Design a protein around this ligand. Structure first.
Ligand SMILES: [Zn+2]
Ligand SMILES: [Zn+2]
Length: 374
């Protein structure tokens, strides 16, 4: 097999790339090219040929339960071997990662971009026919919730042709023609959804903040947990048009609420959802995690006010590990040499003020450090 590489586009989905390779190189459709690829990997006896996917909806390494590394090895082999000129294959693939978004959400990665798994579309991938007809390839962005309008054409993305037969470019191709009715698909205008889409695509879109892409998706994920429902594009842009006082109001309303409803006060009692919901969006880089950065700034300045209400709030060993990004052994190790003064991992032995100062004294990194909110 010697394939001709189609013209590269950095924002192309892996599926669209394989469809264009199949088209350019004379294969009937992408499924026939995948079967032929699997057959070639067998002919050269490639250790993972047997698990190479023939279903275009399962081609990404995240779709492989246990053969994800055989999958990436096959992509590297193909990109290095079967082409006139090496293509960027690995760079288009969506991989699992072990990173997380607080409190408990897993993640995927494409190139250097990390996404919360909650936003990864589970069923039918929408498209923009204007992009398909105009450019001839599909965008990786269509795979992720929150990007609901095309940032280039400003129209909602489409899931279904007018005939109720859902259109999925992975199975029904890159021209934007309906399978069943054989008609080209048509569209169906919120300003707030457009801003978010342009922002998630990586472009400056005021009043949304200029953060690395992984942290933009983190903010979508964070707002969904704050609003406790699917992403509300309107109130999200409204939130950042009044930033930072909009967030200072969320913090102040929250602590006042819990004070109304004293030595027993735990950090989770006063600020539970807010604090542990913000730690990893996806990491504690305070230049980029502006939620955690603003929260720590607000807490540092209110530390000893009101007879130390903030500083005396009680914490677990478990919660101190999530704050400091250390292990449980190190907590017990600091207890013994009396670096940290209070074993029981669930007992609320420690004070936020001590944990905060310990962070400053022993656990600041080049990213997780107070200088970014100063
Ligand atoms: Zn478009
Ligand atoms: Zn139709």
């Amino acid at each position: 097999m010697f394939l001709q590489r189609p013209k590269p586009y950095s924002d192309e989905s892996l599926e669209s790339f394989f469809i264009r390779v199949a088209n350019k190189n004379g294969y009937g459709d992408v499924h026939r090219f995948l079967e032929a690829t699997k057959r070639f990997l067998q002919d050269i006896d490639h250790n993972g040929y047997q698990t190479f996917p023939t279903d275009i909806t399962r081609i990404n390494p995240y779709s492989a339960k246990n053969s994800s590394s055989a999958r990436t090895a096959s992509f590297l082999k193909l990109a290095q071997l079967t082409f006139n000129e090496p293509p960027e294959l690995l760079g288009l693939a969506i991989n699992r990662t072990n990173m997380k978004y607080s409190p408990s959400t897993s993640a995927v990665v494409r190139g250097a971009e990390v996404f919360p798994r909650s936003l990864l579309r589970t069923h039918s991938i929408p498209c923009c026919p204007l992009c398909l007809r105009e450019n001839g390839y599909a965008s990786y962005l269509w795979h992720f919730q929150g990007y609901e309008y095309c940032h280039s054409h400003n129209v909602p993305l489409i899931t279904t042709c007018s005939c109720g037969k859902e259109f999925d470019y992975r199975v029904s191709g890159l021209k934007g023609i309906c399978c069943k009715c054989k008609e080209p698909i048509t569209l169906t205008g919120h300003e707030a959804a457009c801003t978010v889409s342009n922002w998630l695509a990586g472009h400056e879109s005021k009043p949304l903040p200029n953060l690395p892409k992984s942290y933009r998706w983190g903010l979508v994920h964070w707002w969904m947990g704050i609003k406790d429902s699917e992403f509300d594009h309107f109130s999200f842009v409204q939130f950042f048009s009044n930033w930072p006082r909009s967030f200072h109001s969320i913090i102040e309303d929250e602590v006042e609420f819990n004070l109304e409803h004293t030595s027993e006060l735990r950090l989770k009692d006063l600020l539970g959802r807010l604090f542990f919901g913000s730690i990893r969006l996806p990491e504690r880089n305070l230049q980029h995690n502006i939620i955690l950065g603003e929260l720590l700034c607000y807490l540092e300045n209110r530390l000893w006010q009101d007879k130390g209400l903030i500083a005396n709030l009680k914490m677990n060993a478990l919660e101190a590990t999530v704050m400091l990004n250390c292990s449980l052994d190190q907590i017990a190790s600091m207890v013994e040499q009396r670096i940290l003064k209070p074993l029981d991992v669930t007992d609320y032995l420690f004070h936020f003020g001590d944990i905060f100062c310990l962070w400053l004294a022993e656990f600041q990194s080049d990213e997780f450090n107070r200088s970014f909110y100063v």
